[PDB]
Amino acid sequence: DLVAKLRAFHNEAQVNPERKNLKWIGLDLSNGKPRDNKQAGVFEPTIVKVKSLKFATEAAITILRIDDLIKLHPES
Amino acid sequence: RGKGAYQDRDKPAQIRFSNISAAKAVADAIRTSLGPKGMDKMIQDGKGDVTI
Amino acid sequence: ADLQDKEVGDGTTSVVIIAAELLKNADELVKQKIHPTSVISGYRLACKEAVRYINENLIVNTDELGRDCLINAAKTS
Ligand SMILES: Nc1ncnc2c1ncn2[C@@H]1O[C@H](COP(=O)(O)OP(=O)(O)O)[C@@H](O)[C@H]1O
Numbered sequence: 001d002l003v004a005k006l007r008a009f010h011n012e013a014q015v016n017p018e019r020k021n022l023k024w025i026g027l028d029l030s031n032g033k034p035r036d037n038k039q040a041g042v043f044e045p046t047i048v049k050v051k052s053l054k055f056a057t058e059a060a061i062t063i064l065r066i067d068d069l070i071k072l073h074p075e076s
Numbered sequence: 077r078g079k080g081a082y083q084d085r086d087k088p089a090q091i092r093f094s095n096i097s098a099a100k101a102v103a104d105a106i107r108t109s110l111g112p113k114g115m116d117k118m119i120q121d122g123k124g125d126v127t128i
Numbered sequence: 129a130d131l132q133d134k135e136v137g138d139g140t141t142s143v144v145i146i147a148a149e150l151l152k153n154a155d156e157l158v159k160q161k162i163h164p165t166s167v168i169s170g171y172r173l174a175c176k177e178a179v180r181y182i183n184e185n186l187i188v189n190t191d192e193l194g195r196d197c198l199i200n201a202a203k204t205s
């Protein structure tokens with residue numbers, strides 16, 4: 001329900017030009033309800049999200065590229 | 077005339093067949109990684125080194 | 129995770145979780161005979177567009193908030 005409410009709020013923000021203030025709505029974990037996180041003072045550096053996305057995408061691409069494994073038995 | 081050389085020894089034929097089978101096995105093993113749609117292979121050595 | 133720690137210093141758990149979920153969903157796509165090249169291209173395009181959208185619509189300038197922004201970021205961390 002919480003994720004559905006977040007998605008509904010963000011969909012309203014994206015499709016309604018006059019409701020663009022809903023972009024800041026995040027999760028209020030103490031009460032379990034959506035909350036304006038920009039007004040609540042919940043901030044993160046943009047570089048954190050950007051680098052997380054880039055590194056995660058590269059790692060997923062690297063692992064996904066594999067389709068066969070050869071595991072040589074140890075010589076010892 | 078009729079029959080020619082008997083070719084009593086069968087080892088050369090077996091050796092040729094084994095060599096061909098090994099080469100074909102290697103080719104079939106590496107066929108999957110050919111072309112733009114071919115995917116990479118992952119090889120782990122006895123020492124534990126991993127290469128993709 | 130170690131690279132994320134070295135280069136940024138925060139979000140170490142988030143990157144691992146996101147990468148694992150991405151890999152799981154990509155494998156789910158591949159099991160439906162979707163070629164891995166198509167999945168990789170889609171992932172790359174989605175990552176680029178997500179970065180662009182973040183930089184264009186989801187950023188807040190800290191010059192309009194003052195010292196309280198630094199304190200709030202530290203508290204969130
Ligand atoms: N006060 C808060 N209210 C809502 N969400 C928060 C709050 N503080 C942190 N978060 C969220 O919790 C998530 C987990 O962060 P955390 O796991 O502590 O960082 P790391 O991944 O570096 O360990 C972050 O993505 C952040 O957005």
Ligand SMILES: [Mg+2]
Pocket residue numbers: 138139140205
């Ligand atoms: Mg953190």
